[PDB]
């Protein structure tokens, strides 16, 4: 089961809401669509696993920052761009963006 | 720094094929990411293998960083106040340097040197 992104989401004030943990978002970065912003909320301090799965071969990663220099980057490894981050309760912004090519991805925040 | 030259970025540079060339390792690139302009691509050529320093200087307060990858293992800028920096050993070849923002708007300088 997945939830589709909602364009235009190219900046944080237009971020697509990830309504809960354990919700796979589906998106794409085709052509000049190079940025897809999402937001999520943390209600209790804890480890957050953020996982992007590439559905095509292309250069895509992500950058996490709180709504607030605390930023955190996705670690690329083959078809997965991942990280495990200790977050305090708060709203967070997750910029999915590409540096080469074009393609599709899924994004999940696991808690 | 003796010899340093300033050079303006050239829009449109929102994609690697339109990257603004950094022609040597003693140039200061001047750019801005205002409004809808959220990405500036640069490229440079490593002619000899060695350590390269990449430093983005924030002229204004805003959320900006960068991502390096080779034309042919990704490198990210490390944010520390007004400086976003890293050092990486590079082999000869063409490198793509994406300067991009995640919040706000403003100007920056970019210094790729050895
Ligand atoms: Ca999209
Ligand atoms: Ca988008
Ligand atoms: Ca610009
Ligand atoms: Ca630009």
UniProtKB/Swiss-Prot annotation, chain B:
> Where is the site C-terminus of form C1b?
6
Q: Give the residue spans that cross the bilayer.
A: none
Q: Where is this region: Collagen-binding?
A: 98-102
Could you say what the effect of mutating residue 100 to A/S is? S3b fragment has no collagen binding
List locations, semicolon-separated: Secreted
Q: Which residues bind Ca(2+) 6?
A: 11, 13-14, 37, 39-40
Annotated stretches, region: S3b collagen-binding domain? 8-114
**Residues reported to bind Ca(2+) 5:** 9, 11, 32, 37, 40
Q: What processing steps or modifications follow its translation?
A: Upon purification gives 67 kDa, 78 kDa, 82 kDa and 116 kDa (full-length) proteins all of which have the same N-terminus; only the longest form digests insoluble collagen. At least 2 in vivo isolated forms (C1b and C1c) are missing the second collagen-binding domain, ending on Lys-6 and Lys-18 respectively.
> What inducers act on this gene?
RNA levels are high in late logarithmic phase.
Q: Where is this site: C-terminus of form C1c?
A: 18
What applied role does this protein play in biotech? Answer: Widely used for tissue dissociation due to their potent activity on connective tissue. A mix of ColG and ColH is used for isolation of pancreatic islet cells for subsequent transplantation.
Q: Where is this site: Collagen binding?
A: 67, 76
Per the record, the domain comment is: The mature protein has 4 domains; a metalloprotease domain (S1, approximately residues 111-786), S2 (877-882, equivalent to PKD), and 2 collagen-binding domains (CBD) S3a (997-1003) and S3b (1008-1118). The S1 domain has collagen hydrolytic activity. The metalloprotease S1 domain is composed of 3 subdomains which together resemble a saddle; an activator domain (residues 119-388), the catalytic peptidase subdomain (398-670) and a helper subdomain (679-790) joined by a Gly-rich hinge (387-397). The S2 domain (799-880, PKD) is flexible within a larger structure (S1 plus S2, residues 119-880).
Give the protein family.
Belongs to the peptidase M9B family. Collagenase subfamily.
Another remark in the UniProt entry says: Clostridial collagenases enable the bacteria to infiltrate and colonize host tissue, and contribute to gas gangrene (myonecrosis) pathogenesis.
What is the role of this chain? Clostridial collagenases are among the most efficient degraders of eukaryotic collagen known; saprophytes use collagen as a carbon source while pathogens additionally digest collagen to aid in host colonization. Has both tripeptidylcarboxypeptidase on Gly-X-Y and endopeptidase activities; the endopeptidase cuts within the triple helix region of collagen while tripeptidylcarboxypeptidase successively digests the exposed ends, thus clostridial collagenases can digest large sections of collagen.
What's the name of the protein? Collagenase ColG
Its source organism is Hathewaya histolytica (Clostridium histolyticum)
Gene coding for it: colG
């Amino acid at each position: 089961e997945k939830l589709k992104e909602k364009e235009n989401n190219d900046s944080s004030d237009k971020a697509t809401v990830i309504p809960n943990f354990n919700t796979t978002m589906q998106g794409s970065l085709l052509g000049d669509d190079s940025r897809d912003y999402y937001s999520f909320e943390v209600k209790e301090e804890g480890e957050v696993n953020i996982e992007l799965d590439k559905k095509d071969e292309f250069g895509v990663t992500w950058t996490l920052h709180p709504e607030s220099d605390r930023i955190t980057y996705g670690q690329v490894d083959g078809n997965k761009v991942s990280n495990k981050v200790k977050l305090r309760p708060g709203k967070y912004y997750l910029l999915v963006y590409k540096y080469s090519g074009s393609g599709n991805y899924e994004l999940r925040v696991n808690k």
